[PDB]
Design a binder for this molecule. Structure first.
Ligand SMILES: C[As](C)(=O)[O-]
Ligand SMILES: C[As](C)(=O)[O-]
Ligand SMILES: [Zn+2]
Ligand SMILES: [Zn+2]
Ligand SMILES: [Zn+2]
Ligand SMILES: [Zn+2]
Lengths: 314, 329
C-alpha cells in the first residue's frame, strides 16, 4: 500500500512513471562529506542533480529509485534535498554493493540482516528516512561474503516485504547463482529484480528467469560496444514472449561519480546528454515505433514498478 | 612553529604535556559510526565510554592523545571533539589513509591525494573546521602501487605544512625501511616521520638503524598481548603473544643504545572497534583494563624500576612528542 521515500511515505498511485535503478551520486561511504570539492562542491552537485531530475520530470518521470547503498556513498540528506527541489519522489536503498569496508566485510549474516533491517524499519543514519529497497551485488559465481549479503537481504525482505534488486555481470549469467541463493532462503522471485540484465544477448537466460517469476532489470540501456537500440530490443523480445509484467527499465545514470577515474562523469554526459531522460525520450518512442502499444509501455513503466516496490509478502 | 592543531583548536606546544602519540577513540570505517551506531551500543554509549577512559588517563597524568584514525578508519572528528572537551584531554586528529581505502580513494592520483590531505590540514575536516595535526599512512609487506602514492602525497603535504607523518608497519616485515626510502626520495626529513608499531619486533638492528637516521620510533602497542588467549585465533593474530614487558623492554633497549630522543611510546588503545571480529573490544578490555592509562600506570613504573631516570622518561613522554608534533619545515 505505501512506499517509503526520502520525503516520507507515498501511496502506490502517487509513484507514477518510475525509474527503478538510478543514482544521484556514485561514490563511497563518507566521501561526499569528507571531500565535496571532488565534485566542485556539494552545492554544485546538488544543483546538477536538481536540473537533471527536473528534466526527467518534464519527460514524464515521477519517481526514481536510488539504488546507492552505504558503500556507494549514499547521502540520503542530499537525496532529500534534491527530491524536494525537483519535486521527484526518490526511494532510497539499503544493502551492500561491491566496495564494503572492513567493518562490513567482517560481519556475520545475522549482523548484516540487523543493519539492513535498521535502514528499512528505523531509518538511515539519524535522518528518520527509511529505505524502500535492498540493493545487492555479486561478481563471478558469488564470493563467500556476497553470499552472506544476499542471504541477509533475503531475510530483511522477508521481514518487511521490501523488494531486493541486484547488480550482476549478465555476460557471466550471474543472475542464476543469485536466484539459487534467494530461493534457498524462501524468498519469492516476485520480490527480486535481477539487474544489469541488458548487458547480454542471451535471451534464453532472461526468459528462464522471467518464467520463474523474477523481475528483469533492463537498466543500463544508454551505457554504450553494443548499441542502445540492441539493448532496447531485449525489452521487445520479452514483451513478445508474454513477460511484460516481468520487465523493469532504467538508465542507471548518475549526476556525480567518484568511484571511478577522474572526469568519467564528463565522458558519460557527452555520450548520453539526455541523462535520466534517455529512457522516456529515446527508448519509449523507439519501442512505439516498433509497434509496442501505449498500454504495454505504461504497464512497464508505471504498473510494474508499483507492484515491485509496494511492500508485500504475497 | 610552536602551535599545533587539536580538535578544540590550536594550542601552544607547552600545553601538550604528557602525550600518547598513537591512539584511537574508535577503530571503524568511513561512514560506519553514523550509519550503524548500535553496533557500539549507541553513539552516546561510545562517547561515554571514551570519556571515562580519557578521564582515567588524565588522572594518571596524560594531557594529550594523538588519534591516528584516518578517513578509512572511520574517524568521526565531531566525536573526537565531544570527548576531548568532556574529558578535558587534548586530541590531535589525523589525515592520511590507512589500509582500507574505498574505491573513491583507491582510484585517485598522487596529486589528488595531496590535495585531500592538504584540505584536512589547512582548511578542515569535513564541514567541522577542525584541522588535522598529523598525517597517518599505512603499508603492509612490500608497498603496493597505491600505498606508494599515499606515502608520496603524505610527504608532499608534510613538506608544504610542517605537519608530521606517522606510519603503520608490519614490523616483522621490517616495513619501515621501504617507507623511509620513499619518504627520503621525496625530500622529507626523517625527523618529521614516526615509524609505527615498531614494538611488534625484537629486531634491535632494524630499530636502531632507523633511529640512527633520525626517524622517530613508535613503540606504540605496549599492552597488546594475547598471552593466556592462545586458544583465540583472532585475538592472537591481532595482539601477538609477546608480553607487554617484552614490548616495554624495547624502550630501555633504545635508550641504552643512545636513542632516547627518537622514542615515542603509546598504547594504541581504542574505545570501540568495528573493523575486526565482533567481541574483539571486550577481549582487549579484559587483557588491559587500564586502557590508555596503561603507559603511565604500568609501563612508566616498570621502566623506573629498571633504573631509567625520571628525566629520561619525561623526555620521552613529553619532550619527544612536542618536538615531533610542532610543525617544522
Ligand atoms: C554503480 As553501477 C555501474 O554498478 O550501476
Ligand atoms: C587500527 As591499528 C591495529 O593499525 O593501530
Ligand atoms: Zn551495478
Ligand atoms: Zn547502479
Ligand atoms: Zn596500525
Ligand atoms: Zn592504531
Amino acid at each position: 500500500d505505501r512506499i517509503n521515500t526520502v520525503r516520507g511515505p507515498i501511496t502506490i498511485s502517487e509513484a507514477g512513471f518510475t525509474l527503478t535503478h538510478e543514482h544521484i551520486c556514485g561514490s563511497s561511504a563518507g566521501f561526499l562529506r569528507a571531500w565535496p570539492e571532488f565534485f566542485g562542491s556539494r552545492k554544485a552537485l546538488a544543483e546538477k542533480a536538481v536540473r537533471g531530475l527536473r528534466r526527467a520530470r518534464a519527460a514524464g518521470v515521477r519517481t526514481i529509485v536510488d539504488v546507492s547503498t552505504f558503500d556507494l556513498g549514499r547521502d540520503v540528506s542530499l537525496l532529500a534535498e534534491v527530491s524536494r527541489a525537483a519535486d521527484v519522489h526518490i526511494v532510497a536503498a539499503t544493502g551492500l554493493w561491491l566496495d564494503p569496508p572492513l567493518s562490513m566485510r567482517l560481519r556475520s549474516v545475522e549482523e548484516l540482516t540487523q543493519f539492513f533491517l535498521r535502514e528499512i524499519q528505523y531509518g538511515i543514519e539519524d535522518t528518520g528516512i527509511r529505505a524502500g529497497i535492498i540493493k545487492v551485488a555479486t561478481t563471478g559465481k558469488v564470493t563467500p561474503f556476497q553470499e552472506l549479503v544476499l542471504r541477509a537481504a533475503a531475510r530483511a525482505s522477508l521481514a518487511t516485504g521490501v523488494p531486493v534488486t541486484t547488480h550482476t555481470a549478465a555476460s557471466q549469467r550471474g543472475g542464476e547463482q543469485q536466484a539459487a541463493i534467494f530461493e534457498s532462503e524462501g524468498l519469492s522471485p516476485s520480490r527480486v529484480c535481477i539487474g544489469h540484465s541488458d548487458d547480454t544477448d542471451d535471451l534464453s537466460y532472461l526468459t528462464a528467469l522471467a518464467a520463474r517469476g523474477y523481475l528483469i532489470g533492463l537498466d543500463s540501456i544508454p551505457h554504450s560496444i553494443r548499441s542502445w537500440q540492441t539493448r532496447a530490443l531485449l525489452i521487445k523480445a520479452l514483451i513478445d514472449q508474454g513477460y511484460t509484467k516481468q520487465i523493469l527499465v532504467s538508465n542507471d545514470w548518475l549526476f556525480g561519480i567518484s568511484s571511478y577515474v577522474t572526469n568519467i562523469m564528463d565522458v558519460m554526459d557527452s555520450v548520453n546528454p539526455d541523462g535520466m531522460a534517455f529512457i522516456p525520450l529515446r527508448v519509449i518512442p523507439f519501442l512505439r515505433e516498433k509497434g509496442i502499444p501505449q498500454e504495454t509501455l505504461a504497464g512497464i513503466t508505471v504498473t510494474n514498478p508499483a507492484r515491485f516496490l509496494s511492500p508485500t509478502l504475497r
